[PDB]
Design a protein around this nucleic acid. Structure first.
Ligand SMILES: [Zn+2]
Ligand SMILES: [Zn+2]
Lengths: 104, 105, 311, 145, 694, 90
DNA sequence: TTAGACAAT
DNA sequence: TTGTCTAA
């Protein structure tokens, strides 16, 4: 006449057993079914919080740098104006990394 | 690769679904089932109530009210027996009852 | 590392005359001798801060239940910290893990017990908050840890390679359900040790050079100017610099925070390729430091002016 | 390692809260397909043109500073090159398909935006969608800020 | 290509012969079936919202019962109809009908008479039925209520219209105004969000959370929320007339069902059974309910209708249990009828939150088109008209209270029919929404914006006039923000929104336009046989146990109805079986259904399941299913897992399962008029698309 | 305290005995077949069912309905248990 | 030492 | 949206 449930619930109704308190048996509320407080010795709850577990700068074009005079500069495009005109080209030198922009 | 001769023989064997846990320790527990009077209209074919007498609580199981499960209407439930010497899995119509303990009003 | 770019850096230079900017750096070259490089490779580690969430791999909380008398009932809270190994950080204050365990055993447990006694002195309600908060018109040592508090009943620390820690904060029973793991997480975002006053991060991997001179630069991210004056035998403090106008204005002077306003406006305009001539910048820096203090150009800077029609 | 395990570890570099091992894999396609982007332009831009400077009009508008640059004409008569979207390759979906034409976590450079088709002979509909992502990026970033 | 696919009439090349023929200028005897596909989403949505949806939206208005002086008066609408536009009574004319061309030329509104059957009853006994003229509502042209329905082009020229007249537009004071299709969140679906703004909504909230946009038969719309907390407790927040309600989860799950607490425990831990923190947290949610002694369902309902009673504005004579099922019927999962299926939906929305918070499933992107659908003009008519009917009944109550002050003779009514005459007339409060675009509703209609609804169908040319019927507007509130994430072209819009066809200024990225192939689902059919169909396949339902363990089974969500648990080794065999049932038009599967099989991989990918969508107001587009050779309506979330191909060269065996119809399907209508679009740079195409509209 | 132990049922009443057996020993093996809704219970009347793996077994309903797949599972320790009416107890 | 108040694009 | 000014 006994049912196997989780230890946190009554085994005759299905209702929730309260926390242990100032007595030696914890009882359900809606039926009055006493269970030993001593039976919660295997009520173990684990929780693990894991904090911390376990280039060539684009294509090049053979353009001379303003500062260092290197023969090539890496380029990147970005259409920064409206859709009416242009395409703004960003350059970056290979050696000394001097970045200038052209607006066409 | 075992086989079994499917010998459908026909009565509706009840199956129980406890809302408390598994009935793992059977003892002195009385089971009685109830059926509606008017078998004329086709609602009597589903009206059935199973009652469970225990000294502590009483468990009741419907087929129609709120909380009656939908597994035995959107799907059929059968029971195999498999008389092993003869090797025939003889099959009965069955129902599943989700029992709920009765308290008060 | 990053700085503040665009208009709002120029706003917080000119329009605000900000005493508290976000991300101030400072920059000191290294003396570039043999002993100074050896000392400064460790000084890079020493001037950083280290938070506890930086070297901690995982926290393990194992709440249990314990009843030992007819009255005494106890909630066993076996906290366990797994620290990340020493090989996975060679950037922070030479933290051999006995140092972070000493952090633990000295002050982290008291920092934890103050939080537990703040919470234990004590969302589950139907609140119906009366606003949504965001018109008809007709137009259209184990003994030290045990004596920290009586609640700590067990202590076990790792000894061979000092990578973990175990306590047992044995609280009594209470009516609410206690949220231990939230306290242990939110308390474990506190700074460990040797966090220098206001300096977060240092980088001397900027080995930049104009004449292949290998001029190592402590490109820090924090603002403490007399912090670096003890390291004069290693750093070349003669060509020190910062972003902050007020820090050098209170350390070196209004004539040396007059040549930092000019350099910073030139750097903000020079990120974006714009070349502003130095005569304009020198005129602005000689206007703002005219009264001897670093004034803004806002509404609260025209109260100094004389003619009220312009005001 | 076989391609199933490599595809598994790039699925694992994806789908994670770090996004620091994954952005590194962007910078290893994008530095290796920008070695096939320079070799084609050395094959076709100086001495591969039909009519050359000064007899070429477009080279005279480019090189004498009238309009354009040697990036617009390399997009006209050679590849469009890598599509960089917000500094990186265009985004994978929630299923690892970078675009519904392509297999989940496909290794080919075409799958991640390397266009390699010019405007002189047109671009196929995957690269046209990638190029419209890159156009709307700049247009939105101008229109907002 | 499949014959019957709407795109079999696509020309190989242009002809230029149709402008030098004897047949030119003779009207054809039927309209063109290519220009009439562009207002299906407008006309077929307004056709639902006047006959079927109005009959289903007067069933969901409760019997309005108030208190007379010691008598209870009950009002209920039985049936409301919208008559097609005629002349007013007392008019000497020859043809009683009114056509749109009169309403354009005379600068009037093209509108239809509205009337209803209100069934008044005092003290529980009926004493009459009244047929009451509520007001005038606008009529969409070429709908089932316009007078231009079913006309041939030669009889349509005769009434001053045009041949190939597609409807879709309201004449409001002489100015034609379309309703633009906004973007709304995907209806009846748990959208797992990670939004750190939600941390400030309570004392222990997390950045995590699962939202749901619930809509009940195209006339109601309510957003709800779930929140994971620092404890492991789950809250549940929902606004009801500008009142943010806080409701814990266990209170909801106890107020819904009569189950014992071990079953409510069991339903929330199905996949994660070896987790200790999870079982602890879903114990604590139920214990919070236990703390007040609310052990039964009736006692939980008593407590909830005790605490929430004053803000729900229920009458003084309801019990607490009756004002508790007034907030579970009109706020929480209103697309479900039964409280049993509301329960197993909150269990799935809770398990998705528990898998999100533990990092076992990734965020569903709210701005992606996978998790989005459109708000057609059938919703915004029907929701607003339902709300104005409820406002009309509340005005009748205020009219009785105005009669009771300065106390009248105040006897029985006896078909008095003066309070209805003194009642409010919803001509002008229904005209204001169209004539300005401003939605002044006390509900909010479950929406996210307030203005920008009706936009003038401008007609400067025909390129501009087509575009208003293909416009998909992201939001008229995002134009003020400084965001870029909502304005980003994403690869999930391959063929459902056009890449090039957008404006360039402040609305760049917001005002998207549909493609040519993409079409909005407007058909509303009945999914009554599909649960029994699924359970005849491997779907073991909720109550029984699948025969492998859980976490080796998939949830099934048949339009917000939790159905069952597909075994993991039988989920492809149900996905391809439902696709074969879809493209072959078998077994009452709609041809516009989604069979989305998000698989299990063990990595924190999308939250796995076998989702099935049958709703209206979605986006769908045809492909060719390669293994069948037949045209398949792929939805927005199916093609994120399908290997569609473009060219017959790029089709492989084993890898490829579909193929687009014609390879320029990704482009709009307006962007398919640019010659050689693949040769010029893409802002040039994006500029030409808004040049041709000027 | 006061347990209910109900005996009240207004339209219902108890039952006579039926033809299902009562004796379960080592010779019987309880199988729990879960069949579809439109599964006619006479279809496999001469056919076999698998006890391990799966098998696509035919029926006799119309000859063309016959494709049924049978999934042979492991014991779940299922919570549904059988009630066999014994003849010693009325 | 920290919250309302006041002006600008 | 800043940033300082005023009052508790
Ligand atoms: Zn109990
Ligand atoms: Zn250079």
């Amino acid at each position: 006449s006994s049912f196997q449930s989780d230890l946190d619930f009554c085994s005759d109704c299905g209702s929730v057993l309260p926390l242990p308190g100032a007595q030696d048996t914890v009882t359900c509320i809606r039926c009055g079914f006493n269970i030993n407080v001593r039976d919660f010795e295997g009520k173990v709850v684990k929780t693990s919080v894991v904090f911390h577990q376990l280039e060539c700068q684009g294509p090049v074009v053979d353009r001379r740098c303003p500062r260092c005079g290197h023969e090539g500069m890496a380029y990147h495009t970005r259409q920064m104006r409206s859709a009416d005109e242009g395409q703004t080209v960003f350059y970056t030198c290979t050696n000394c990394k001097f970045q200038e922009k052209e607006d066409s | 690769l075992p086989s079994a001769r499917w010998q459908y023989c026909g009565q509706r064997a009840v199956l129980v679904q406890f809302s408390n846990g598994k009935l793992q320790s059977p003892g002195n527990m009385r089971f009685t089932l109830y059926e509606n009077k008017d078998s004329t209209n086709p609602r009597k074919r589903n009206q059935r109530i199973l009652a469970a007498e225990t000294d502590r609580l009483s468990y009741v199981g419907n087929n129609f009210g709120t909380g009656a499960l939908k597994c035995n209407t959107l799907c059929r439930h059968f029971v195999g027996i498999l008389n092993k010497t003869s090797g025939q899995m003889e099959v009965y119509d069955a129902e599943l009852f989700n029992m709920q303990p009765l308290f008060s009003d | 590392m990053n700085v503040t770019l665009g208009i709002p850096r120029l706003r917080e230079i000119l329009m605000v005359a900000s005493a508290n900017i976000k991300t101030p750096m400072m920059s000191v070259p290294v003396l570039n001798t043999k002993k100074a490089l050896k000392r400064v490779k460790s000084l890079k580690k020493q001037l950083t801060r280290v938070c506890l969430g930086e070297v901690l791999q995982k926290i393990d909380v194992q709440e249990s239940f314990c009843m030992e008398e007819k009255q005494n009932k106890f909630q066993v809270y076996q906290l366990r910290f797994q620290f990340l190994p020493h090989a996975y950080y060679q950037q922070e204050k030479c933290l051999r893990p006995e140092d972070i365990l000493r952090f633990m055993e000295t002050r982290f447990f008291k920092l934890l017990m103050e939080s537990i006694k703040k919470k234990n002195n004590k969302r589950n309600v139907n609140t119906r908050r009366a606003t949504q908060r965001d018109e008809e018109g007709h137009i259209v040592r184990v003994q030290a840890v045990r004596e920290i508090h009586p609640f700590i009943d067990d202590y076990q620390y790792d000894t061979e390679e000092s990578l973990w820690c175990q306590v047992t904060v044995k609280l009594p029973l209470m009516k609410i359900n206690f949220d231990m793991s939230s306290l242990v997480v939110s308390l474990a975002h506190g700074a460990v040790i040797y966090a220098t006053k206001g300096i977060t991060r240092c980088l001397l991997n900027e080995t930049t050079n104009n004449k292949n001179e290998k001029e190592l630069v402590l490109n820090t991210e924090g603002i403490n100017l007399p912090e670096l004056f003890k390291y004069a035998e290693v750093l070349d403090l003669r060509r020190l610099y910062s972003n902050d106008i007020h820090a050098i204005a209170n350390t070196y002077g209004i004539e040396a925070a007059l040549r930092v306003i000019e350099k910073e406006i030139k750097d903000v305009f020079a990120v974006y390729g714009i070349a502003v001539d130095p005569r304009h910048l020198s005129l602005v820096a000689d206007y703002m430091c005219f009264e001897g203090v670093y004034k803004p150009l806002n509404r609260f800077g025209i109260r100094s002016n004389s003619s009220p029609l312009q005001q | 390692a076989s391609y199933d395990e490599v595809r598994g570890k790039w699925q694992d570099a994806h789908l994670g809260k770090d996004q620091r091992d994954f952005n590194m894999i962007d910078l290893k396609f994008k530095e290796e397909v920008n070695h096939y982007s320079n070799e084609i332009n050395k094959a076709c831009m100086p001495f591969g043109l039909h009519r050359q400077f000064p007899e070429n009009s477009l080279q005279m508008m480019v090189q004498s500073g009238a309009k354009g640059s040697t990036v617009n004409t390399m997009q006209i008569s050679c590849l469009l090159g890598q599509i960089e979207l917000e500094g990186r390759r265009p985004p994978l979906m929630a299923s690892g398909k970078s675009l519904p034409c392509f297999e989940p976590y496909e290794f080919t450079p075409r799958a991640g935006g390397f266009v390699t088709g010019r405007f002189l002979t047109g671009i196929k509909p995957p690269e046209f969608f990638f190029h419209c992502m890159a156009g709307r990026e700049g247009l939105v970033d101008t229109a907002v800020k | 290509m499949d014959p019957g696919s709407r795109w079999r009439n696509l020309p190989s090349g242009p002809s230029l012969k149709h402008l030098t023929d004897p047949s030119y200028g003779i009207p054809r005897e039927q309209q063109k079936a290519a220009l009439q596909e562009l207002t299906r989403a407008h006309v077929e949505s307004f056709n639902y919202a006047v006959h079927e949806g109005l009959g289903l939206a007067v069933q969901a208005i409760p019997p309005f019962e108030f208190a007379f002086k010691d008598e209870r008066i009950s009002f209920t609408i039985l049936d409301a109809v919208i008559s097609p536009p005629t002349v007013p009574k007392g008019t000497i004319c020859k043809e009683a009908n009114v056509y749109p061309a009169e309403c354009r030329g005379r600068r009037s509104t093209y509108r239809g008479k509205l009337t209803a059957d209100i069934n008044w009853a005092v003290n529980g006994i009926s004493k009459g039925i009244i047929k009451q003229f509520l007001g005038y509502v606008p009529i969409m042209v070429k709908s089932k209520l316009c007078n231009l329905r079913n006309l041939p082009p030669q009889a349509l020229i005769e009434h001053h219209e045009e041949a190939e007249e597609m409807g879709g537009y309201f004449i409001i004071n002489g100015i034609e105004k379309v309703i633009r299709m906004l973007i709304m969140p995907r209806r009846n679906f748990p959208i797992a969000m990670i939004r750190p703004k939600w941390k400030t909504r309570g004392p222990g909230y997390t950045q995590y959370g699962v939202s749901m946009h619930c809509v009940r038969e195209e006339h109601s719309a309510v957003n709800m929320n779930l929140h994971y907390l620092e404890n492991g407790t789950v809250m549940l927040n929902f606004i009801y007339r500008k009142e943010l309600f806080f409701l814990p989860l266990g209170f909801a799950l106890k107020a819904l069902v009569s189950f014992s607490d071990y079953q409510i425990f069991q339903e929330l831990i199905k996949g994660k059974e070896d987790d200790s923190f999870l079982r602890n947290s879903v114990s604590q949610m139920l214990r919070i309910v236990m703390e007040e002694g609310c052990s039964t369902q009736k006692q939980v309902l008593n407590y909830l209708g005790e605490c929430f009673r004053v803000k729900l504005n229920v009458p003084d004579w309801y019990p607490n249990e009756q004002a508790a099922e007034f907030l579970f019927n009109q706020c929480i999962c209103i697309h479900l009828k039964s409280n049993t299926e509301k329960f197993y939906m909150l269990c799935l929305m809770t398990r998705k939150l528990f898998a999100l918070a533990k990092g076992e499933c990734m965020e569903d992107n709210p701005d992606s088109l996978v998790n989005q659908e459109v708000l057609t003009p059938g919703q915004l008519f029907l929701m607003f008209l339902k709300e104005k009917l409820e406002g009309w009944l509340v005005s009748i109550k205020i009219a009785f209270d105005k009669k009771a002050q300065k106390t009248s003779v105040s006897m029985n009514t006896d078909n008095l029919m003066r309070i209805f005459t003194m009642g409010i007339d919803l001509t002008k409060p229904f005209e204001y929404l169209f004539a300005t675009g401003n939605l002044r509703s006390k509900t909010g209609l479950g929406l996210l914006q307030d203005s920008g609804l009706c936009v003038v169908a401008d007609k400067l040319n025909f390129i501009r006039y087509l575009s208003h019927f293909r416009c998909v507007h992201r939001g008229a509130d995002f134009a003020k923000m400084r965001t870029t994430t909502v304005r980003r072209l994403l690869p999930e819009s391959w063929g459902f929104l056009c890449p090039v066809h957008t404006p360039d200024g402040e609305p760049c990225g917001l005002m998207n336009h549909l493609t040519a192939v993409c079409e909005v689902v407007t058909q509303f059919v009945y999914t009554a046989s599909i649960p029994a169909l699924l359970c005849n396949l491997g779907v073991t339902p909720i109550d029984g146990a699948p025969h492998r363990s859980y976490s080796e089974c998939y949830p099934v969500l048949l339009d917000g109805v939790m159905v069952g648990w597909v075994d993991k080794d039988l989920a492809p065999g149900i996905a391809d079986s439902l696709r074969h049932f879809k493209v072959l038009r078998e077994k009452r599967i709609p041809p516009w259904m989604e069979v989305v099989l998000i698989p299990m991989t063990g990595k924190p990918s999308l939250y796995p399941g076998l989702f099935l969508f049958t709703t209206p107001c979605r986006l769908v587009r045809p492909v060719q299913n390669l293994a069948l050779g037949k045209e398949e309506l792929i939805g927005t979330m199916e093609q994120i897992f399908m290997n569609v191909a473009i060219f017959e060269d790029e089709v492989f065996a084993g890898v490829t399962t579909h193929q687009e119809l014609f390879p320029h399907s990704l482009l709009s209508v307006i962007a398919n008029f640019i010659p050689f679009s693949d040769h010029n740079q893409s802002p040039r195409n994006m500029y030409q698309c808004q040049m041709g509209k000027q | 305290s006061c347990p209910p132990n109900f005996t009240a049922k207004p339209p219902a009443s108890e039952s006579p005995r039926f033809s299902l057996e009562a004796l379960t020993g080592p010779d019987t093996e309880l199988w729990l077949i879960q069949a579809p809704a439109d599964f006619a219970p006479e279809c496999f009347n001469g056919r076999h069912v698998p006890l391990s793996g799966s098998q696509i077994v035919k029926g006799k309903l119309a000859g063309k309905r016959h494709r049924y797949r049978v999934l042979s599972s492991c014991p779940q320790a299922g919570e549904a248990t059988l009630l066999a009416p014994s003849t010693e107890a009325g």
